[PDB]
RNA sequence: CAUUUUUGGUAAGCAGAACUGGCGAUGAGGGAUGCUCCUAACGCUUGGAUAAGGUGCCUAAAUAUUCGCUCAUGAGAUCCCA
RNA sequence: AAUUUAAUUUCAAUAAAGCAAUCCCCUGAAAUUGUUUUCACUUUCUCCCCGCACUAAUGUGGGGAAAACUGGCUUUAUUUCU
């Protein structure tokens, strides 16, 4: 058992932060993110004038300490997102059949065609706020980008899950779409 | 105990405790109108509650399900069955106690303009720790097929607009009364005024 | 270095809860035979338990209690951690903290309540008569007002 | 004084010796302090120690003195360190704990409560070996170190509790956890 | 307005039960705002009246009354044991009872 | 038949013994429920105060106080005793 | 709701004096049981220096000093101020 646990999180230059009773809100260059924390005990205190956020816990236990670190990192990701969007580079791999990637609906809905010659379409609609662009560079790269660290990852995960094969040795058959590079725009 | 009807806003109450407290009052003879049962909380995680309820749903007589235990799926009726469990309902005095209780989801019309009470002993926030999961009865009801949750929610919103209009008028009325009272305070004879003042009225 | 308008910012920094159980804070006992008394928090024993001490003005002696039985008030005196009863009597009277509590709304309501409970039969009638008179004047004014 | 917060553990100083005989003209005299729920219980515990350590039983010995000890300054804090021998379901262990309290007696009462809670030790199953007041700089357990900080303060965050007079079955509106 | 009470309201609970055994000699009464042993103790010496209505006349009137006495507190929570001249009929469980000012 | 001592038998609500107490022939209160467990042995009543056991509701007593521990997507909860 | 004289290391103010500074009532850690000696232990709404607002903290992290307000003791009176 322990009396006090704290953490102090710097705020980047461009952000408009505004917390209120564990409803944290961050706005910035690339849109506004709201992300509730009122499930958790926590004495979030704000500091607009000199920047920084202070997270402070009273009477923690190691569970609580873990939570404080979890909240702060997640908040920092949100700042990172609004300042400079997350770019997740996903390379589409094929041994044999050429996997056809058709982006429609204003960088929503990536339609994936011809996976292992199946002659059937796999559609994976994105999370809101999520661009699916294609690379101009290396032909099989596909860009999943956005403000929210969660939504881009979930979209990427959805794409990855949607593709991969069934009942063949996964040691041998490698075809499918994978996450290469975690970056920002 | 001694009033004609307690109306209870069941929102934020813990199932068992609310039932036990209601049952003792019913047995003694106090009439209880239980309203707004969907935001009754059962304690613990949702999945756990669903699984337990699924076993209760699973239970049926082999012979003839017409004479099987009645399941129910409606939140008010769930509360009611639980209250019946906490009374000796196969007796005649007990049967009267069960009858004394009336339950309903949302708030019907003759209960619209009567005061809702809360039982502070059975309030969730003062009895479940804040890192231990909890669960809305209405949600549970939707998952096991009640399918009348959205409609009740629509009704709650409608009542709130009526309530806010009434409250705004009322607050204004309190201001008028208060303003008249302070003004006509110094039309009272000194001695009487002083006694009234002494006890700060 | 010192603060000029950063002073204002710190001042209106609205912390989510005040009244830390720090030595010298005023407390209203909510439970047990010494309930309804006011008292100062002297020491802190351990995470559960605190040493409370009435003023010799408020009249409950120095003793250990569990923290759960107190309801802390805004007001606090600037006393040293070490403090014992003589220094506490001299200080509490001098800075007039009880008076501040009495002037505060909850204290004011407390003193009215104590009188109202203790009030004699004549007094009970008297309040009714005065209130009835008030109702007559007030009702007449409302009727006039239209 | 509040009975509800009362405990009945006291410290008794006991002195005894063996009955003199032709073989033993002047016996070795033994004194000990023992933490007990009454003086008879103190004696019994002392007798059990006499049987376990020395060669003696109640029947062939005599008590020289029995007196209660009570704390000199019961309203100033001390850090008490205790060393225990206890028996578990498998076997036997020695252990060292620290307690912030106002008397030795308070420390033992908390310790019995703790040993029951964390180790399922029944009162029978506990044996006190040495309790002494320890300096703040020498404290070894983290929760006691935290208390010993320079300007201790914290917010209250415990739920309200109150007399039977106000703990009524119906209320005007939802009460608030918050507090100021 | 007319005929103001001068008695404290009450509710006739059960008999002086124990689990699955019944004693009809004592009735258990809850009094309007009593709630503790100490508060209950204030009423201990006082007179109790159970008044009830019947369908047809007795002594020319529709009301009869059984008289009792408070006689000891019961438990912590302010319930009182009351002894009547004749056992209270159990159909009156949850009915009203009057705790008068006398003696 | 129970504790304790105990021989046969893999064990058995099995077979056979030892000491004592029961039960049988024995209600009553408790153990939810029960021939044997606990309490306690019984004329008829009135008041008192308890035992064994309980005190969220069923259910009479505390949603008592006080310090701990415990989350379980088949928790845990009372000698004999399941 | 109380109450008598005992007994058991109880206390605490009061208001005039004084005494010692990591000092003191105490309590630590050290060189056939006594006993003495070493250095260890207080405050702070004080001051200074670095970190200059760095905090959960109307303050602060570190590093130094200061004092006796505070605490502790010795006296002398005093007990319905308490």
TrEMBL record, chain B:
Matches recorded under InterPro entries: Ribosomal_uL13, Ribosomal_uL13_euk/arc, Ribosomal_uL13_sf
Single GO molecular function: structural constituent of ribosome
A cellular-component GO term for this protein: ribosome
Signal peptide: none
GO biological process: negative regulation of translation; translation
Keyword Magnesium part of the UniProt annotation: no
Pfam family, one: Ribosomal_L13
Keywords tagged on the record: Ribonucleoprotein, Ribosomal protein
Family, as annotated: Belongs to the universal ribosomal protein uL13 family.
HAMAP family referenced in this protein's UniProt entry, alphabetically: Ribosomal_uL13
Name of this protein: 60S ribosomal protein L13, putative
Species of origin: Plasmodium falciparum (isolate 3D7)
UniProtKB/TrEMBL annotation, chain C:
Record CDD domains: eL14
GO MF annotation: an example: structural constituent of ribosome
Signal listed as a keyword: no
Keywords of the record: Ribonucleoprotein, Ribosomal protein
Pfam families: Ribosomal_L14e
Coiled-coil region(s): none
Similarity comment: Belongs to the eukaryotic ribosomal protein eL14 family.
Protein name per Swiss-Prot or TrEMBL: 60S ribosomal protein L14, putative
The organism of origin for this protein: Plasmodium falciparum (isolate 3D7)
TrEMBL record, chain D:
Entry's Gene Ontology molecular function annotations: structural constituent of ribosome
Database matches in SUPFAM superfamilies: RplX-like
Domain Large ribosomal subunit protein eL20 as annotated: residue spans: 10-132
GO cellular component, one term: cytosolic large ribosomal subunit
Keywords, sorted A to Z: Ribonucleoprotein, Ribosomal protein
Gene3D superfamilies according to UniProt: 3.10.20.10
InterPro entries named among the record's database cross-references: Ribosomal_eL20, Ribosomal_eL20_dom, Ribosomal_eL20_eukaryotes
Gene Ontology annotations of biological process type: cytoplasmic translation; translation
Family the entry assigns: Belongs to the eukaryotic ribosomal protein eL20 family.
Designated name of the protein: 60S ribosomal protein L18a
Automatic annotation (TrEMBL), chain E:
Protein name, as recorded: 60S ribosomal protein L35ae, putative
Included range, full protein: 35 to 137 of 140
Family affiliation: Belongs to the eukaryotic ribosomal protein eL33 family.
Alphabetical UniProt keywords: Ribonucleoprotein, Ribosomal protein
A biological process term (GO) from this entry: translation
Molecular function, one GO term: structural constituent of ribosome
GO cellular component, one term: cytosolic large ribosomal subunit
Species of the source: Plasmodium falciparum (isolate 3D7)
